[PDB]
Amino acid sequence: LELRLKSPVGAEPAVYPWPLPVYDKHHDAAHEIIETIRWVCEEIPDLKLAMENYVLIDYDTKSFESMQRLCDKYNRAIDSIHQLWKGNTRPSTGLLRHILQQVYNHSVTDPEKLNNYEPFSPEVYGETSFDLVAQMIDEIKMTDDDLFVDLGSGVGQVVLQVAAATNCKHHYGVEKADIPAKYAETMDREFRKWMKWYGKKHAEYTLERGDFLSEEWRERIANTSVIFVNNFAFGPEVDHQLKERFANMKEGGRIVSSKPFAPLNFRINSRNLSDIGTIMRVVELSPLKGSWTGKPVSYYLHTIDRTILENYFSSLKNP
């Protein structure tokens, strides 16, 4: 009692047991199967031609025979296409959203175990987070010279999105908490598997368990060109310690966060020379300022710039 979907690129088939798993009250593997077939048909026009027109309209998700017929119709169409071609790019944003949801659904089987009541829960990543990360990727424009680090990466969703979208040398996710770090290990395996199934390319990435405030992570942060950090719930000790880590970054180093690390209107004077604002520019980025119909949300871009401090010293010596 199982359903199989052949890979469009000839990777191992996707195998689902019957009864099909339920993800939540309105989401299940039956809808994941249908949407997977629709995405494959969308980015292979010959498949849309080969597949019989009625198959994706008349289905019963609660009938094994109906779900098996649908799966077999898609599989036969994949075979006809593999016969035609007989005689890896980055995923589109739409496909990437589907891949990340699918990776989460196969990985995080018990979402209760996360103990996350915040609007930044991994359970609701596809809601606003995905769109805001997509907006962030278009705004910061990373290259092969960049190293991306998500400090407090949860189950690794931001890392997986950024690695699928950009050409950074490497993407890192560091998570301290045991439950999301263990789930991140499954997210990693499922992501690599599904990306191979779709025939999609991603950059190199590593999801690791660790404390980003440790001695080891001090030099690592200093050598990072792009830091992503959801610092919304951080206490003053973690905030203070992080600012010390950032103070060792290179000129042009960037930090993307949910709360600014320095005031947006920082003005250097003799009484605030210790403040992180003396060595970084800070800008508020908002998709409502940047065709956005989502949440009225903002994020913050910090850029290491020691000329802020230099100009202050030059202005004292050269009035």
Ligand SMILES: COc1ccnc2ccc(N(C)c3c(Cl)cccc3Cl)cc12
């Ligand atoms: C449900 O999502 C959100 C709700 C409210 N505000 C938000 C602020 C930022 C954000 N993201 C994805 C993010 C970015 Cl793009 C850069 C750095 C840090 C973060 Cl957490 C998500 C938000």
